[PDB]
């Protein structure tokens, strides 16, 4: 009697919903704390003019999103659907990192 969608067809609205938008996916302020705690290791003090953190976020998508468009192809390849931990470890390896 409550409306329950069959599993599978809820995500297929989100693929229609997120592939249209150009919003930054990750939250801004939790990512801004993360950048400083990696500069903490090998520099005494840095200041980080704020348009750089708006810039470094952009190359944490086109490395992540471009991975997930490629790690899906190997999961289809083995007649499966769910991506796996041993799919990334293949799809990173052929790229050469």
């Amino acid at each position: 009697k409550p409306h329950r969608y069959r599993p599978g067809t809820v995500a297929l609205r989100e693929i229609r919903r997120y592939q249209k938008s150009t919003e930054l996916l990750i939250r801004k302020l939790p990512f801004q704390r993360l950048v400083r705690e990696i500069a903490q290791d090998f520099k005494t003090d840095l200041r980080f003019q704020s348009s750089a953190v708006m810039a470094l976020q952009e190359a944490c998508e086109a490395y992540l999103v471009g991975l997930f468009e490629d790690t899906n192809l190997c999961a289809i390849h083995a007649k499966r659907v769910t991506i796996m931990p041993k799919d990334i470890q293949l799809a990173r390896r052929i790229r050469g990192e």
Partner: protein, 112 residues
């Protein structure tokens, strides 16, 4: 010696041919620079930028706005195979991706 014939006017172009000729000597690309060369170089930047802006401006009249938003410049590069190999290693800011689902993930109509 009458008045002010710039080299863009003496060519029939739009990009500043005098400006490019400064931006070779002060980049240290060679020792002696040619004179007929930056006339030629100002055409190739013209023909390329006339090719891109025509493409997005076509799609911008179908999304029913009238400006050109950087999302629209994403949609007019990855959908033309003359150009996608030229900029295949570029990440446009605020870019977005192309609408793209694989085949088998579509809902199978087993008994519909």
């Amino acid at each position: 010696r009458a008045k002010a014939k710039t080299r863009s006017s003496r060519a029939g172009l739009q990009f500043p041919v005098g400006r490019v000729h400064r931006l070779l000597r002060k980049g240290n690309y060679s020792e002696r620079v040619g004179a007929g060369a930056p006339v030629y170089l100002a055409a190739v930047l013209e023909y390329l930028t006339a090719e891109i802006l025509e493409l997005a401006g076509n799609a911008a009249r179908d999304n029913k706005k009238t400006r050109i938003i950087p999302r629209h410049l994403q949609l007019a590069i990855r959908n033309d195979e003359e150009l996608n190999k030229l900029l295949g290693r570029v990440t446009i800011a605020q870019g977005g991706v192309l609408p793209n689902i694989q085949a088998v993930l579509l809902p199978k109509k087993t008994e519909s």
